[PDB]
Symmetry: D5
Subunit: 186 residues, 10 copies
């Protein structure tokens, strides 16, 4: 898998809050990032997923997490989608266009027979290492609240070497401190 | 991503409720299956994840879903861990041993430098097609509840061709019906 | 050059007068076809080129010519564009989506560094042979009147073997009857 | 195709206004150039095409555009043809001989089975970049007026970065200015 | 060299006494042939050579010999040259056009850097076997008289197996009858 | 063809006027040379050919032309043949032995199924460039007088740049002076 | 065979007397080493073998020999086994975990179809050279006292260059001094 | 390792009790075999080992075990060695000669830089499966008694399906009956 | 070495008793044959060797042995040499001409840098198997009497299976009988 | 053939007059050497051949010729053979062992299917060049007296440049002085 591997350099145009910009791996350095891939603009499941992420974007930014949604459509298409759909209109993060498919292939996420990216999400830490991955079938929407829980645990372990987050962990709950004595006792 | 691909043939020994059994892809045919990979027996995060799934086993069995946990330890080791650990003793699903690492590699889930599988979960349908995937870093435990939501979502899309489950879908909530009129409307 | 070569098999989804249909080379056999490639939807020059063609569609149809616009965007995007743009709304011909870029590559017309098709037009006869080709730079708009002239010339030499259309030929003007005596005399 | 690519180096013999000269890519550097390929000397369609260009040569020269006709015939043959045909007689631009076919293949315009070049026109800017391409079947003549419209549009875009020419643009007509806001509105 | 080898199949367009015909290796079978290669039409040395051969055509036809001149020019060019030159107009044999260079290459006679054939002559017997080869530099004209002496010698050995024509041999002169007795006696 | 190419270096043993000498490319530098190949010593046609050349040796030497007869026999064999054949005895030039076939292959003159050289002659100028080539069948003898005309024609054009020898040219006749004005005239 | 070859570099985690340590080839430099491979933890023959060795561990240490048991199980497993089994509990040497199977493949001792190491023992001298090898089938336990005999013999020939140990050799008994005179005598 | 693999086919000349014979794999089928390799005849350690094996030949024969000693010497050398050596003379089993090194290489036992076999012993059961392997360095002689124990253990397991022999097992001691209940117990 | 290998098919021209013949391997089948290679005709050591063999030809023929002398010269040269030399004149066996070098190379006897065969002798039995080989430097002549001792020895072992000829063996002396007693005795 | 090639470097153990030594190409530099290959020790023919050579050791030594017998047996076997055979016991030259078959292969003298050298003899000069070769079948013994003749003739041609030894040459007999005049007269 790509788990625990460094993301690859990339260069893409994106639509973000009314303007076109260029995004590269340099923009991710030193930051937590979420690469949110979806099949295509103007579809059915994708907007509700992108809307869901938008509903948690202020919390993600406060956590120092940037979000980049990615599809194989052009940034021009994203711009138009943003103007015509009310749920896409609330998006204030960068919507990356990946028409050559290089960003999508970098994440091993292209459905070759369709020219579209699969429904996948990648959490990337400040050193660019992928810490959590989620991929679902075409007809199955993702859940932003699950993404957030995983991000908080990833941030928690980064700040607490020697500790690990048990299943279901949430801020305030007990963690584990790996030791030779704890081996077999849990 | 192995999303939307058929699982490959396999034959592994396993430990299940007191005895050793052989498990192959034939056992998965016609059923919903969950392949739950974890790094190693007698560790910290893993036990909590395995117990968490055990807590939902009744629910999963009622959904006609079989659980197969997998690690590169042997089935002998799984039996030993099942005797000495409170949490592991409550496991009633099959614990597959994958010492050759072939099962783990079939799922592109091997940490080659460690000889251990990554923390990955695969939801597989009755036709052997992978419908959902989740992979997390070593120190981040999974949450069985998220898994259950995706499973139900998958079973719903399988039972209702023409319908897809939007973001955060839960049984009882509206679904979407892809059509030409819906394009751009959501 | 692809001049005088037969078009290759293809299968693509498209938007046409309110509905999504599938187009293959079988749909072009026995008819005159114009493949009209453009970079991307929601752009600037492309809209004018598509409208210009739509302005001549009545004429092209009387001539028994089908038109297929092609871009690497999806058919969903075309539909959204057909609804938000007043000039695109007048397109009554098929708008083919080519997200995998296969069709575009068949016509050797892909700008690989952009994942977008170049501004090219191909006139194909009923036998599937390419009789005319036009390609212009990104910022230069094509002229539909010019396309029509080429089509009529191609249709003339088609129906009148042994006869060829000289420079500036139009419907009704003098043609040439290639013979040994005329050699070197013009 | 070769759209937006730089022309390759070449060195060929040509007949021009009563004398034999050598033409290389250095001759095109700093100037706008049209490479006009035709199948063969002493034929039928070609004559009317080369003459049509000669009729527009004054205009082309005023626009700083040179013209180079090309066929796989030798320069000797061009000289004889110029001195035996009233139409070819009025040609003042360079008539290049490409007996090795190298120039023709550089432009990917060789009919390998006949050893003759196809009816292709290439508009090359002062930096050697190909900005417009036209290819027609053997029995279809080209129109020099169409060529002039493309050169003017090409020259205009080169002189006005940030501006593009819509379909059917002519000197003095409204041009487009690609903005983020214009996306989807045109 | 190609001495004593069978010519390869070919299919070219040629000019012969006011008309255009097709020439294949099937037209040579059953007869004596002379393949006369020259650089280019409308030149200097070639006409004198083609004319010289024309001055011996009568004698050759009597000897059942067919002459085919070959250059990389087209058959159209040959027709135009026939008309414009006093010496060329008296050519009654077939003038083959080899624009693809295939025929010239079958005889290993192409000057690759010029795209023109070298000054070479090949004498081929009724079975397609090359019996004599002559090749001279660009500025060295051939002599039809010598061609005839060789044609006669070739025809003599063909009709008199066991006998060979010594140096300088000519019709009605002492030939040689190879035998074990003559070894080292001549 | 090997026409207009430079001979390759070589180092062979030869028999000349009663002694064994070594001949290399150096020996040809700055001198006109004729490489006279023949199949084998003690044969039939070859003696008469080698004798014919012997008769024109004065004339050739006077013209600054050296003669080298070549066969795949050794130099020992040449001496023996020079001592037993009245005609061979008159040979004053060098008889090269090419047992390895190297020299013969340098001139692309080997009958591979026999290990013997074909009946071929090469005229080489002082710069080592092949200016004339003649090859005949096994049973056909060569005519020295034909060689001299070509040698003279070769020497002429070498000392009269800009001028070319027409067909049948002989010392003391009208040569051609190519130009843009003589194109088509002749 | 790997007999008389140097061990390859390796890096593994081990369990030793209550703690986890890292072992590499560096740790064996300058000491006699025994690499004791076995199939899997929590099994039947293996425990008795490991215990057999533990019972000889004091004598081995007096001989300056370190012992490393190796299986493809993890070091966590070894710890659990050390706590749960009475015979394993008496092991005071390092228990190496080799989940990648690298150490195992270095010694060409992997049962590829099981992902388990074979029942093999290797004696390695201070310079890392293998001086003795033993491998038995899955069902055949090894005898630690035979190991010791070979170790003592390996140490003897090492400290006495010029002497070899005959069969059945025990400390104190006669040895041989290879000489030319001793050839064929014994 | 070659453990648990089937021996390959071979054909070698051997010396056995005064005469020369031929041994092949066929001779090992249905019986127990011990392939005893040694470096060279007329040496020091080897004689003592071969003699040791001789001392146990009765015991081995009663056990149904055939013994083949192997070295890269010829069978001629073996005979001569069997005459001049008191120890070798007492050998009554087959002494295989393997000058091509083929038999030795089948058992992966060749010291390539010496052309001599290493000191290795293989125990092969009636089905040709290698059950035990022992290899010692040049100066370390083997012990026949340990071979016997291993053979008896190999025979006991073969004759007692479901049982395995623990460390230090000898006829009359406790064996193990692998079962799920025993996992972790020993 | 070629010793004990079968000769390869060949077809060469040869001179034998005043006539030219063809020799192939069919000629050698069922007969003892001697292939006598020498560097070149008309030399120095060769005649004496060929003459030496000729002095023994009557004895050889009586023993059913044929002789084929071989050199890379032609059969014509052999004929000439047969007339001019009193020694060669006595040769009654076939003198094979091998101008292509194939026969010589079949016997791995070519001096590549000279194009001449080395001084080698090969004795070939009726089944085409090479039983004796002799090769000497350029200046060392061979001795036919020794060739005769070998032929006789080879014939003896062929007609007396189980018997071998000791060193110096000659018609009449005692031979040896390979067995088991004579091992190490002689 | 290895005739006229330099011997390759080698390092081998050997038995020489009661002691083992090491022989390398160094030992042959500056001296005449004879390498005598034979199949195997303790055989039948080889003994007589080796003794025959020993009978000529004095002579050979007085000539500055060293002898090295070679077989793929070890030097240990040679020693034992030198002690159990009256005739091998009289050998005073070096008996090289070549169990790796490397020395034997350097002289292209290995019977691959037996692992033994063929009966071959090589005479090497002070510069390490092979001047004479003799190879015989298994059952054909060599003659030392013929070897001696070739050795003397080889020493003569070396110490007398310009002279060669005719067939059957023995010291004190006529030699040949290779020159242009003698060509053909012998």
């Amino acid at each position: 898998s790509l788990i625990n591997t460094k993301i690859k350099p990339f260069k893409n145009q994106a639509f973000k809050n009314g303007e076109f910009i260029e995004v590269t791996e340099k923009d991710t350095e030193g930051r937590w990032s979420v690469f949110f891939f979806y099949p295509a603009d103007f579809t059915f499941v994708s907007p509700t997923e992108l809307g869901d992420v938008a509903d948690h974007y202020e919390e993600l930014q406060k956590l120092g997490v940037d979000v980049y949604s990615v599809s194989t459509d052009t940034h021009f298409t994203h711009k138009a989608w943003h103007s015509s759909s009310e749920t896409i209109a609330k998006i204030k993060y960068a919507m990356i266009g990946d028409p050559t498919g290089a960003l999508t292939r970098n994440f091993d996420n292209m459905r070759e027979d369709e020219g579209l990216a699969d429904r996948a999400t990648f959490v990337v830490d400040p050193q660019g290492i992928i810490q959590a991955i989620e991929v679902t079938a075409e007809g199955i929407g993702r859940d932003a609240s699950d993404l957030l829980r995983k991000i908080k645990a990833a941030q928690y372990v980064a700040a607490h070497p020697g500790e690990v987050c048990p299943a279901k962990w949430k801020e305030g709950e007990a963690t584990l401190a790996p030791s030779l004595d704890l081996v077999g006792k849990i």
